[PDB]
Amino acid sequence: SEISRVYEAYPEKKATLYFLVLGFLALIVGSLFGPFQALNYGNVDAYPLLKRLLPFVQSYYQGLTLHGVLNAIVFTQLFAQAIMVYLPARELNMRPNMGLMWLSWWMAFIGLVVAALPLLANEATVLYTFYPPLKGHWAFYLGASVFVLSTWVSIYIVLDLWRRWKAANPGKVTPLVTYMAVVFWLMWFLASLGLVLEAVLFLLPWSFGLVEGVDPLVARTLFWWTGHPIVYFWLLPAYAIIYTILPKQAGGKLVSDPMARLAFLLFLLLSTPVGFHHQFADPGIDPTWKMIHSVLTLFVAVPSLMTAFTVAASLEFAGRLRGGRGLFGWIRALPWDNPAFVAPVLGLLGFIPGGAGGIVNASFTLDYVVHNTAWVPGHFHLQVASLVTLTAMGSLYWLLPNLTGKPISDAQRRLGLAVVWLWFLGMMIMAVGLHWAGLLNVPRRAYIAQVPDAYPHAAVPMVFNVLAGIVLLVALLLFIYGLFSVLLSRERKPELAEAPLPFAEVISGPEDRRLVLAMDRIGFWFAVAAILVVLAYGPTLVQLFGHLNPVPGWRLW
Amino acid sequence: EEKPKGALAVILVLTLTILVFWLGVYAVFFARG
Amino acid sequence: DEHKAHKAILAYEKGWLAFSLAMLFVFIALIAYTLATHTAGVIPAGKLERVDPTTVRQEGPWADPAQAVVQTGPNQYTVYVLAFAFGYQPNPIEVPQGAEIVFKITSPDVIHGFHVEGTNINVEVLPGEVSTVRYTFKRPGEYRIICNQYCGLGHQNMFGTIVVKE
Numbered sequence: 001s002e003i004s005r006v007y008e009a010y011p012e013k014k015a016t017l018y019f020l021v022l023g024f025l026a027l028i029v030g031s032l033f034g035p036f037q038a039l040n041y042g043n044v045d046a047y048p049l050l051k052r053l054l055p056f057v058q059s060y061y062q063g064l065t066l067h068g069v070l071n072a073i074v075f076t077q078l079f080a081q082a083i084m085v086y087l088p089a090r091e092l093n094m095r096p097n098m099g100l101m102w103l104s105w106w107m108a109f110i111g112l113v114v115a116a117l118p119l120l121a122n123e124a125t126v127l128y129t130f131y132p133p134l135k136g137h138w139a140f141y142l143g144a145s146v147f148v149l150s151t152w153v154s155i156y157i158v159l160d161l162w163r164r165w166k167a168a169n170p171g172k173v174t175p176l177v178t179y180m181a182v183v184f185w186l187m188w189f190l191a192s193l194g195l196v197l198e199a200v201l202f203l204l205p206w207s208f209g210l211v212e213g214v215d216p217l218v219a220r221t222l223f224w225w226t227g228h229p230i231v232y233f234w235l236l237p238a239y240a241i242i243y244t245i246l247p248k249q250a251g252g253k254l255v256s257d258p259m260a261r262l263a264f265l266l267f268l269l270l271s272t273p274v275g276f277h278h279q280f281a282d283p284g285i286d287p288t289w290k291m292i293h294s295v296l297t298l299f300v301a302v303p304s305l306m307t308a309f310t311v312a313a314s315l316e317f318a319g320r321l322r323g324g325r326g327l328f329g330w331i332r333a334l335p336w337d338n339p340a341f342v343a344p345v346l347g348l349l350g351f352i353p354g355g356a357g358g359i360v361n362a363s364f365t366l367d368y369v370v371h372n373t374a375w376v377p378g379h380f381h382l383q384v385a386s387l388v389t390l391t392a393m394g395s396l397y398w399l400l401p402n403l404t405g406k407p408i409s410d411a412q413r414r415l416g417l418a419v420v421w422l423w424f425l426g427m428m429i430m431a432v433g434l435h436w437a438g439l440l441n442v443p444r445r446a447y448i449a450q451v452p453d454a455y456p457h458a459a460v461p462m463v464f465n466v467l468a469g470i471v472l473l474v475a476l477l478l479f480i481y482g483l484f485s486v487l488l489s490r491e492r493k494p495e496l497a498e499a500p501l502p503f504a505e506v507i508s509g510p511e512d513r514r515l516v517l518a519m520d521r522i523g524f525w526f527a528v529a530a531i532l533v534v535l536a537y538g539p540t541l542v543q544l545f546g547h548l549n550p551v552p553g554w555r556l557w
Numbered sequence: 558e559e560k561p562k563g564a565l566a567v568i569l570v571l572t573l574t575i576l577v578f579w580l581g582v583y584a585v586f587f588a589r590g
Numbered sequence: 591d592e593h594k595a596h597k598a599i600l601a602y603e604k605g606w607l608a609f610s611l612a613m614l615f616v617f618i619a620l621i622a623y624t625l626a627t628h629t630a631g632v633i634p635a636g637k638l639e640r641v642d643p644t645t646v647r648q649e650g651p652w653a654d655p656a657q658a659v660v661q662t663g664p665n666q667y668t669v670y671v672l673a674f675a676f677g678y679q680p681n682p683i684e685v686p687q688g689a690e691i692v693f694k695i696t697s698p699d700v701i702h703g704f705h706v707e708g709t710n711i712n713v714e715v716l717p718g719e720v721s722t723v724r725y726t727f728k729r730p731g732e733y734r735i736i737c738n739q740y741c742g743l744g745h746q747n748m749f750g751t752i753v754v755k756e
């Protein structure tokens with residue numbers, strides 16, 4: 001029972017779409033709270049209006065949970081699942097196990113729904129970090145558990161694709177996108193253990209009534225085992241696109257296949273064993289281990305530092321082929337008329353300030369300046385809410401058509417550029433507002449418009465937060481309008497749904513071979529990564545598990 | 558063609574931005590010590 | 591062209607990597623420096639100091655607010671602070687400037703933040719655990735404590751006061 005021969009031949013196309021759609025739907029719903037949160041940090045309290053529009057909304061904090069959950073968790077995961085399965089499938093021209101692929105979508109959907117109910121009913125106002133003793137409804141923890149576990153299936157699917165391909169090409173190096181996808185999912189698997197453990201050992205039995213107490217330190221230690229790498233789980237799918245698709249859109253090539261492999265390899269190695277950087281201000285964790293994690297965290301910055309050069313060189317290369325002039329001529333030669341190009345390039349621009357923010361946060365002692373302040377949200381909106389999201393948004397211009405056969409008119413294309421610029425601009429203004437107020441000790445996760453006189457010294461940065469909120473409100477609206485206009489038209493060119501993905505060509509060298517070969521020792525690197533995790537977490541976790549001090553749960557909303 | 562002037566210009570901006578952030582906050586750390 | 595640009599990029603890539611690593615190691619040296627100074631006091635105590643969160647304000651150093659401050663050295667004063675659902679005990683904390691104030695903070699309910707505006711004191715407060723930070727005020731006044739970890743509906747209004755003594 002399938003109406004287009006395109007989906008019978010490429011069924012993975014359909015599954016991919018459902019992941020995407022569900023992903024953006026969650027993005028829209030979660031982002032609605034954004035403008036109001038910005039105004040809040042501009043000292044303006046718009047929540048009564050929101051409450052009038054969305055009656056179910058009971059507080060600032062319930063809205064912040066939905067925001068953090070739907071945007072940072074749901075949207076990102078679904079996008080990942082879409083990208084890091086579909087791209088390697090199309091590159092290999094192999095069909096993913098479809099029984100499993102649909103299974104993973106249903107898990108994500110069912111899990112999302114189940115968790116949505118207690119969130120929407122104010123039964124789970126604990127934020128996207130859900131730190132105990134703060135106790136949510138069981139269906140929040142169960143829903144999340146299922147939703148995340150969906151990824152385990154995704155991992156399998158990709159590994160399967162990879163084994164099968166290695167069988168039909170004995171002695172051939174893993175193709176680039178596939179390689180990325182493989183190290184990606186493997187990394188995620190090792191990363192996910194922290195959360196799984198927390199859920200299985202504490203969270204789930206806690207919320208089902210089996211136990212009455214949960215040790216807060218151990219729960220947050222396990223959380224951040226997963227907590228940091230998850231952001232890379234958000235980042236790498238965009239990276240994948242940036243390395244292998246953006247150069248094409250820019251009219252150039254990826255200047256180095258090995259560089260891209262190395263970057264991804266480093267991430268497999270260094271993504272998980274750095275979680276204490278989220279725990280600098282915690283007690284009961286040895287200061288030496290914090291320093292160790294601090295160093296490992298500065299090392300995990302290396303991959304990004306490489307990416308910066310590799311991508312910039314590829315964009316410079318592309319600009320030159322387009323008739324690039326001098327030091328900055330290449331820049332103007334790029335296709336600023338194409339959103340799929342523009343969106344991610346803007347994201348990368350703001351990523352510079354974003355990354356510098358991270359490195360600061362990473363410097364142990366220096367975290368004490370900014371920890372839990374508005375600086376941190378400032379940092380990450382540059383990272384996830386900007387680069388990842390824009391990339392995701394911009395990829396709609398090649399991806400959506402490739403999946404649906406629906407073309408994009410010139411009007412939509414230009415509508416896209418406006419959304420893109422506004423989103424970016426809005427994000428930049430907010431970044432300045434939150435960083436500034438963060439140095440002025442304004443805390444994050446705070447409804448500070450309810451205490452107007454509490455932060456008088458943040459007068460001017462409050463203005464920027466108001467501005468952004470407006471800017472971004474407009475952009476979001478335009479996105480919704482533009483997104484649906486595309487998904488709600490009946491123009492269907494089935495030929496463009498059958499066109500290949502705009503993968504970029506890769507420039508290779510002589511020395512490549514032996515380095516590339518080394519990197520392709522996946523089984524070896526995996527164990528290596530595994531060993532680092534046991535080395536960085538083992539010592540501490542052992543001591544914590546010997547001295548468990550569970551405390552009772554609380555509801556403070 | 559030749560030396561990546563544009564790419565080097567990018568990673569120069571990045572490097573300087575890193576330095577302003579790090580040394581800017583390294584200063585505040587000691588100012589609040 | 592194209593294969594000439596490959597060798598040039600990959601060569602400036604290696605130079606970039608060497609430089610980056612060198613910059614990072616300088617940071618590592620400038621962080622190792624701050625660990626050997628007096629500023630490193632704000633680093634939470636590493637050893638585990640378990641407490642019951644359900645009996646903390648019934649029996650123990652946190653039971654009586656009047657015995658919060660206690661001279662434990664010639665210039666050392668140990669303050670037993672209690673971060674609780676939307677407030678701090680004692681309020682205000684009163685200490686002499688120039689003296690080494692050893693805070694020992696815990697919570698009876700959920701996680702709280704202990705952020706002393708103007709200082710490097712920024713520590714998470716965990717139920718059933720003692721957060722132990724050392725600090726020396728060098729300027730007189732009323733330092734405001736802010737709770738920077740979401741702790742419920744009154745979280746935005748959870749403030750404290752430390753009055754260092756001229």
Ligand code: HAS
Pocket residue numbers: 129231232234235277278297298300301304305307308309311312315331345348349351352354355356357358359360361362363367370371372376379380383384388567571
């Ligand atoms: C998806 C978004 C995420 C990314 C990516 C990310 C990157 C880093 N972060 Fe982070 N982060 C921290 C450290 C880092 C470091 C060292 C990096 C690094 O990976 C960053 C490396 C980046 C670079 C080294 C920049 C490279 C620049 C590039 C690649 C752009 C070049 C541009 C080009 C080429 C374009 C040019 C184009 C032309 C046309 C010219 C720390 C501390 O160590 C904290 C704790 C703070 C606290 O106290 O709570 C933290 C907190 C967070 C939280 C808060 C979680 C919570 O709620 O508690 C989130 C959500 C988050 C996300 C993300 N974070 N981070």
Ligand code: HEM
Pocket residue numbers: 031032033034035036037038041064065067068069071072075127128129377381384385386389443444445446447468469472473476
């Ligand atoms: C419409 C555009 C957006 C605006 C105006 C916006 C604004 C904000 C603001 C002001 C905060 C601070 C809230 C507080 O500290 O109390 C915040 C937090 C946050 N934002 Fe957004 N945001 C937007 C979109 C996004 C996107 C696209 C993502 C991820 C893809 C995202 C993820 C988050 C997360 C995870 C938090 C922290 C949640 C927490 O601390 O509980 N936001 N946002």
Ligand code: CUA
Pocket residue numbers: 674676701702703737738739740741742744745746748
């Ligand atoms: Cu204690 Cu917010």
Ligand SMILES: [Cu+2]
Pocket residue numbers: 227228229231277278
């Ligand atoms: Cu992190």
Ligand SMILES: [Xe]
Pocket residue numbers: 141144145199203
């Ligand atoms: Xe969970």
Ligand SMILES: [Xe]
Pocket residue numbers: 069073074111112115143144147
């Ligand atoms: Xe979820």
Ligand SMILES: [Xe]
Pocket residue numbers: 144145146148149195196199
């Ligand atoms: Xe999980």
Ligand SMILES: [Xe]
Pocket residue numbers: 227228230
């Ligand atoms: Xe997270």
